[PDB]
């Protein structure tokens, strides 16, 4: 639902309403109706609830960073001059009610309205198409309400009182409907421990098996030891969902909704989150969260801390005046001192604030904020930067509650203005990366269901630390989940576990941690041997729908956007050493790194020599051939520490072993080296590993299949060497599929076919090395493109979006491909003769 004004809809729906007028005889000639709606007679308001009835509209907010930035809604006619928006989408639109405008687009044709209801409807676009996580989940105030409702107060009023040889339990109720009659008297706190009798709520699994043993039914009674808030919460969840009985931190809510989605339909989850917001709003107004300089509490230990640290600062300055210390090392030590005082003040603040405090509740509930702000407010702002970007050894030993002095308030403007300045260049860098990632794609639509391959990449799922337990890898919901299998699982006994062609989610993870198996082979786009695009099985399950991806789904734009959107959350350049957006740009463009590290062209052992400021490694192989050498190794780049699981390996040393493609120096290998030594597949895997390392280290969840799409398109061509018997020139760039099909269909005299070597390109060259001429004529030099294309009698297969937009024709995605446009519809014979 969206709330739309009246003098806005009216304009949008002027034709439909003129139609219903000239039909309902409020106007005789369409010009009379247009004049009417132009002066807005009082009769153009009683039909506008007839056309609006199930005629969606699309809401857009700029900047549009990804898919959910446009969403369809059903209009509810409200009076005013503002748009009423649901508080659960705002996290996707990235909206706030502080002056933010928004645009409304009306679809007209049947195809458009149906796309809006079925694809672009908000009740269906619940999950991120980047990680599968929910976005239409409860926000700040909802979280506060549900964290107040579902929390336990040891010492409350109306609690269970441990029968005492004189009275029974004294805190027990026969139904929620009775604890509510108590609540409304003063006898029961909604957050008190009690025993209730529940019939309509399904117990947990432990009890549902420990008390029934034949299956719990609606109407069967059990006795729960809970609060009334947890009950009224679990009455918002589906009839069958087990009773939770847990404080509803935002993470727990995310969990529950993930489960609902992985087990129930998506209409159910929409209804459930609607219920949760209603209730969280009810119970935030009735939570007691309100600010007051009393509620803002100052630790008492602060003074002891600050003076204890000023003692050490005095000592430092004494050294400085004694000559045992320079003017920069001094500042370094002062910073390293007044950086710990802030830690201690924050720790004290955490250990002194009660839990019933609103400033700690709004934080620990996961609603908004963090403890660094809480320190800045009740503790101490601490250190601040200069306009350069360095630190200032003079800290801010005052909070915004005490009140900064004049100077403190002066040296805190530097970083503030730096932020307000940078916060457009940051957006621009992210947008540049996204523009590239989108241009390299536009041909990666899903075209078929399966390629009938066993090609796949192997994924680790867990590791055994103590060697008797396997430990579940951390980034397995990004590497293994949502993917599709290629080889039936197997254990040391030869027993099958999971089937091939299977989705792979928490169920399969659980049931594969059983047989002690950790490395399972999975399918990927990096291996889909398809003519154009990828098979729906190599890709996996779409994270929006949670099921297998459909045919015609544009998955390159999805990856582009899923990588761009969090780009502002990353470190940047000074307006490698800082591996953020610069590193991503350094990988997707196949650039030689600054801190390049050399890898092992061979396996074997190492002889390590070192002289003044230089390392020289010599790899004596294990086969018995020619040893290689790496001689001019700047001792600046120390070495490749390994930190093996056991024994505390430490550094790479002499007599140690080396696998091919292994890294000798700490730093960053060169993709082209990896490519020639290891090969294309390992190149792709290395690139994905590095990109996802970058992101992970900075708290962004992107499933590797997006990285894999882009990479795939970066290693999608060959340079020909020996034409063979083919219509190919040497030194030319030819797409690997055409190349395979050409040197494969040539069977006549198939004794010397074309020879080619892979080449590693970037996401900007790879967009110049395209096979179309409409796209490339819209980007770069038109006349030469057209000349060359015309002498070669080129053909544009229209496999992409760019050229289809240019022409003005439909796109080869979703409701554009032949499979769908030309669907024939007929009523059944049975229901035809029912006229």
């Amino acid at each position: 639902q969206c709330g739309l004004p009246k003098l806005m809809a009216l304009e949008l729906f002027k034709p439909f309403v003129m139609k219903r007028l000239v039909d309902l005889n409020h106007a005789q000639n369409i010009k009379s109706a247009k004049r009417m709606v132009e002066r807005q007679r009082p009769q153009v308001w009683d039909v506008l609830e007839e056309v609006i009835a199930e005629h969606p509209v699309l809401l857009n907010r700029a900047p549009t960073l990804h898919r959910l930035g446009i969403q369809a809604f059903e209009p509810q006619l409200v009076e005013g001059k503002a748009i009423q928006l649901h508080p659960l989408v705002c996290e996707a639109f990235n909206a706030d009610f502080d002056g933010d405008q928004m645009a409304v687009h009306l679809p007209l044709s049947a195809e458009a309205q149906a796309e809006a209801r079925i694809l672009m409807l908000s009740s269906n676009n619940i999950l991120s198409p980047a990680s599968g996580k929910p976005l239409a989940m409860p926000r700040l105030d909802m979280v506060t309400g549900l964290y107040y409702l579902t929390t336990l107060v040891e010492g409350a009023t109306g609690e269970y009182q441990a029968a005492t040889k004189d009275a029974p339990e004294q805190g027990v109720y026969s139904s929620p409907a009775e604890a509510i009659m108590a609540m409304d008297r003063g006898a029961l706190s909604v957050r008190a421990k009690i025993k209730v009798r529940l019939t309509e709520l399904r117990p947990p699994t432990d009890l549902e098996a420990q008390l029934f043993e034949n299956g719990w039914k609606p109407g069967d009674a059990w006795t729960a030891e809970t609060t009334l808030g947890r009950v009224m919460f679990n009455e918002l969840l589906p009839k069958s969902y087990p009773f939770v009985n847990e404080q509803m931190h935002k993470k727990v809510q995310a969990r529950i909704i993930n489960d609902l989605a992985e087990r129930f339909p998506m209409i159910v989850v929409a209804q459930t989150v609607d219920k949760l917001k209603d209730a969280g709003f009810y119970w935030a107004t009735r939570s007691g969260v309100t600010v007051s300089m009393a509620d803002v509490l100052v630790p008492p230990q602060k003074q002891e801390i600050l003076e204890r640290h000023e003692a050490e600062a005095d000592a430092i300055e004494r050294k400085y005046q004694r000559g045992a210390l320079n003017h920069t090392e001094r500042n370094e030590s002062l910073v390293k001192i007044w950086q710990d005082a802030t830690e201690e003040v924050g720790k004290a603040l955490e250990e002194f604030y009660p839990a019933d405090n609103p400033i700690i509740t709004i934080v620990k509930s996961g609603a908004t904020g963090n403890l660094t702000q809480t320190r800045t407010l009740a503790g101490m702002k601490g250190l601040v930067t200069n306009p350069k970007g360095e630190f200032i050894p003079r800290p801010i030993k005052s909070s915004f509650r005490e009140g900064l002095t004049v100077l403190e308030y002066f040296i805190n403007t530097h970083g503030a203005r730096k932020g307000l300045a940078d916060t457009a260049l940051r957006t621009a860098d992210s947008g540049y990366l996204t523009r590239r990632l989108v241009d390299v794609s536009q041909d990666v639509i899903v075209r078929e269901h399966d390629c009938e391959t066993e090609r796949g990449i192997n994924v680790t799922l867990a590791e055994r630390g103590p060697d008797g337990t396997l430990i579940r890898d951390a980034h397995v919901e990004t590497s293994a989940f949502a993917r599709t299998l290629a080889t039936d699982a197997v254990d040391a006994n030869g027993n099958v576990i999971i089937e091939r062609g299977h989705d792979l989610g928490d169920p399969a993870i659980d049931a594969l941690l059983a047989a002690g198996i950790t490395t399972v082979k999975v399918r990927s786009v990096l291996t889909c041997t398809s003519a154009t695009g990828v098979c729906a099985m190599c890709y996996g399950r779409s994270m929006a729908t949670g099921k297998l991806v459909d045919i015609g789904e544009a998955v390159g734009i999805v990856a582009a956007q899923s990588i761009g959107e969090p780009g502002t959350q990353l470190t940047m350049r000074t307006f490698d050493i800082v591996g953020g957006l610069p590193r991503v740009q350094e990988l997707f463009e196949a650039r030689v790194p600054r801190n390049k590290a050399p890898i092992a062209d061979v396996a074997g052992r190492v002889r390590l020599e070192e002289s003044d400021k230089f390392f020289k490694i010599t790899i004596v192989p294990d086969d018995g051939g020619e040893e290689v050498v790496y001689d001019k190794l700047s001792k600046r780049q120390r070495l490749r520490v390994i930190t093996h699981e056991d024994g505390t390996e430490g550094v790479l040393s002499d007599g140690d072993h080396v696998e091919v493609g292994d890294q000798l120096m700490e730093g960053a290998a060169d993709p082209h080296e990896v490519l020639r030594v290891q090969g294309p597949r390992e190149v792709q895997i290395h690139l994905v590993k590095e990109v996802q390392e970058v992101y992970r280290a900075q708290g962004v969840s992107i499933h590797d299949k997006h990285i894999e799409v882009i990479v795939r398109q970066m290693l999608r061509r060959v340079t020909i060497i020996d034409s063979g018997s083919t219509e190919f020139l040497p030194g030319s760039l030819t797409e690997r599929a055409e190349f395979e099909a050409e040197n494969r269909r040539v069977v006549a005299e198939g004794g010397e076919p074309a020879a080619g070597r892979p080449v590693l390109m970037g996401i900007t060259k790879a967009s110049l090395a395209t096979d179309s001429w409409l796209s490339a004529a819209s980007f770069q030099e038109t006349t030469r493109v057209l000349t060359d294309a015309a002498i070669n009698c080129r053909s544009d297969k229209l496999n992409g979006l760019k050229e289809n937009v240019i022409i003005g024709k439909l796109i080869p995605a979703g409701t554009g491909i032949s499979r769908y446009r030309n669907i024939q519809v007929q009523p059944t014979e049975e229901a035809r003769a029912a006229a």
Partner: protein, 233 residues
């Protein structure tokens, strides 16, 4: 002042002893006005009867478990708190329950005095063990709404007398919801949806009419001062 649109009351049955009423269209604001009043009127202003205490043989101390019966004292207390019972004398009437010998006991195995009625006679109470039995007294009386236990008895003249919370109201749950409506071209009116869940001793409709009567009595106790210049419909 003649009000506009003459609001109407429609019903919508959901079960036998559960219903959902809708009042529409109300002037803007009269939904939250009377909703909570109605709610508290239904939940604490219709008189009815309920158990008030019980007396079991065997358990004078250590109110944990009862001989030769599978349930503890607590599940039995709950079951009886769910007991539905009328009364016509407004007096601490007393009833008895005995099912000597193993089996399964239901309110149907209660023999009440005059007037005292039991609409839910199949309610489960206990499941006796082989060579077991049950003897208990049930104190019943009348009142309104909900009343926690009563232990304002300085000395115990009745030992083993376990007092229990008392649901004197035939109404167990009510929830109201105000929604918007448009009348002719002005939305932001008030529609009121109130859902009622009672005991078999009365239909929702009857409770709603009783509450309406009570609140009429009160606001007439207010209107009797001057009886002039109000709304009319």
């Amino acid at each position: 002042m003649l009000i506009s649109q003459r609001p109407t009351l429609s019903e919508e049955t959901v079960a036998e002893n559960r219903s959902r009423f809708v009042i529409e269209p109300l002037e803007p604001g009269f939904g939250y006005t009377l909703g909570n009043s109605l709610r508290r009127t239904l939940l604490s202003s219709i008189p009815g009867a309920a158990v008030t205490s019980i007396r079991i043989d065997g358990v004078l101390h250590e109110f944990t478990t009862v001989p030769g019966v599978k349930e503890d004292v607590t599940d039995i207390i709950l079951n009886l708190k769910g007991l539905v019972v009328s009364s016509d004398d407004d007096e601490p009437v007393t009833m008895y329950l005995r099912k000597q010998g193993p089996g399964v006991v239901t309110a149907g195995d209660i023999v009440p005095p005059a007037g005292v009625t039991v609409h839910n006679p199949d309610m489960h109470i206990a499941t006796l063990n082989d060579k077991g039995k049950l003897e208990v007294e049930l104190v019943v009386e009348r009142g309104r709404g909900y009343v926690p236990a009563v232990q304002n008895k300085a000395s115990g003249a009745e030992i083993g007398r376990i007092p229990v919370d008392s649901i004197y109201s035939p109404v167990l749950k009510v929830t109201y919801k105000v929604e918007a409506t448009r009348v002719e071209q002005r939305t932001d009116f008030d529609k009121l949806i109130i859902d009622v869940e009672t005991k078999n001793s009365i239909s929702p409709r009857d409770a709603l009419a009783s509450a309406g009567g009570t609140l009429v009595e009160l606001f007439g106790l207010a209107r009797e001062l001057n009886a002039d210049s109000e709304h009319i419909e």
